[PDB]
Symmetry: C3
Subunit: 183 residues, 3 copies
């Protein structure tokens, strides 16, 4: 119960543009007041599988959203499928869907929901990953905490790029970050 | 009472003095994972010289430093830029009621990161990161973190913020950055 | 379980890049359950990579440091890092017994498979940038790859490279933090 994850296999678990077009590998490990997070993405099919910005000059970003309720349970409007998200058991998941994971949620005082008051940038973490592990193929992973509606907590990953890629498969190196835990 | 986390609390109440009294909120969380401290930092400037950057008007305003100085018990010294009043071990979203007296296990390791001396100075006591002003991807600024290089203390953690772009009316409030360092014990 | 496996934090050379004991690799691995929190820096003290001059030697642009492990997570003798002071922490030194088992500190084989003819995914790589002499205008890239070496059950390799034309620049670095998924 110290780690929530997607099993680190390559079986698609995520829907960006079409059903099960991607494998998000996300590992959240609770180190007390902070969650240590490790993320990568493999797009296996559909619109975002092979990037060609000569053909499609405006296809330059997409977003994967994890939406959680008050008990830290994943909501079905999330891009990541519910069947694929649970506490670790060996290299797999527990057979039983978890009921509570509030200790893994992003802190609401650190990262408040949208309101009429001033919005601060500290609810964002920026990182760069590399497509196909090539050092000349950067893309930005923007991670934002608790900025989605229709939920109590959220983690969203926005992937974007500024270079003009021609026939580049969207599968990434890994990135580590952390965030302040709710409890 | 959370003895594994020293922090500023996660509120936005100013706790730090860069150019003038309580002109900023340094949000800093140090979580002890044994021999390493996992650190998470961001900064919100609310007033004074570093609140609104305009390098067309002020071409020389390009950097500033926030210093955390610690005595032999890991207690924050009052000449630090960070205030002592809300730097403490965690209790919920606030702090423990009494000011802590020992935090040596959170201090940067003196063999990894020695104080200045006649011995060769090595770069491993620095960590560089980039954060983004206002969360905008075209507004980078560098955060340079240095361990145990200040005099007049047993330990130190200093944050130097700097930028190279000519920003015009850009508020200095940052995205968050995570790093770690080797603990003293 | 909560332990630290490390090189010790001293500056005594422990690593062989081009010639024997030409460098100090400072590496600290801390187990936080299913992830290992890693902290790394490098000091080259002698040999080919100590002082970089790309005006006189423009092709000297990269080098690799490898840690090879057996089925029990024990460091192999043919790694660039020496076995003598790679062990579990005790104060600012090591435990007096060389460790027998560290499978919990090894990179997860499903996340990061050994080389095979299956597709090689990029998720077994982490890129970072460190700075030579602590100077902000002297970046070098540290590319870390998991379980891509043969003749071992697990591996961590550090490739250091740079694109700037450095002139008489000493190769000693700032520190970088990353994590990886643990085997157990
Ligand atoms: C990478 C690059 O080209 N940077 C140059 C920048 O170019 C702009 C875009 O780069 C950014 C940006 O907007 O600033 C870089 C951000 O980090 C990115 N944000 C994130 C979250 O990753 C950001 C985003 O990717 C984009 O904005 C998208 O949102 O990009 C660059 O992408 C863009 O490139 C394309 C464009 O995409 C295309 O559309 C177009 O067709 O072609 C352009 C090419 O122009 O261009 C943007 C500019 O219009 O521009 C700035 C000035 O505006 C600089 O030139 C910058 O390069 C740097 O300049 C400084 C001096 O001014 C130094 O030379 C920097 O080199 C280093 C060095 O010395 O080696 C790098 C070191 O890592 C750094 N050290 C540390 C510790 O951080 C040092 C140090 O800062 C200085 O030495 C001071 O001590 O600087 C050099 O990178
Ligand atoms: Zn394909
Ligand atoms: Zn303001
Ligand atoms: Zn030297």
């Amino acid at each position: 119960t110290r780690t929530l994850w997607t099993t680190p296999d390559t079986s698609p678990n995520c829907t960006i543009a079409q059903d099960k077009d991607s494998k998000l590998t996300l590992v959240l490990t609770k180190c007390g007041s902070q969650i240590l997070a490790n993320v990568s993405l493999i797009v296996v099919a559909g619109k975002y599988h092979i990037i060609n910005n000569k053909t499609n000059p405006k296809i330059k970003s997409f977003t994967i959203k994890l939406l959680f309720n008050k008990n830290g349970v994943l909501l079905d409007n999330s891009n990541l499928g519910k069947a694929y998200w649970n506490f670790r058991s060996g290299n797999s998941n527990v057979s039983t869907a978890y009921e509570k994971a509030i200790g893994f949620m992003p802190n609401l005082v650190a990262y408040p929901k949208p309101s009429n008051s001033k919005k601060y940038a500290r609810d964002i973490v920026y990182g760069t990953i590399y497509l196909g592990g090539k050092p000349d193929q950067p893309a930005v992973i923007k991670t934002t905490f608790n900025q989605e509606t229709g939920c109590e907590y959220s983690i969203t990953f926005n992937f974007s790029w500024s270079k003009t890629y021609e026939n580049v498969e969207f599968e990434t190196t890994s990135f580590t970050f952390s965030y302040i835990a709710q409890e």
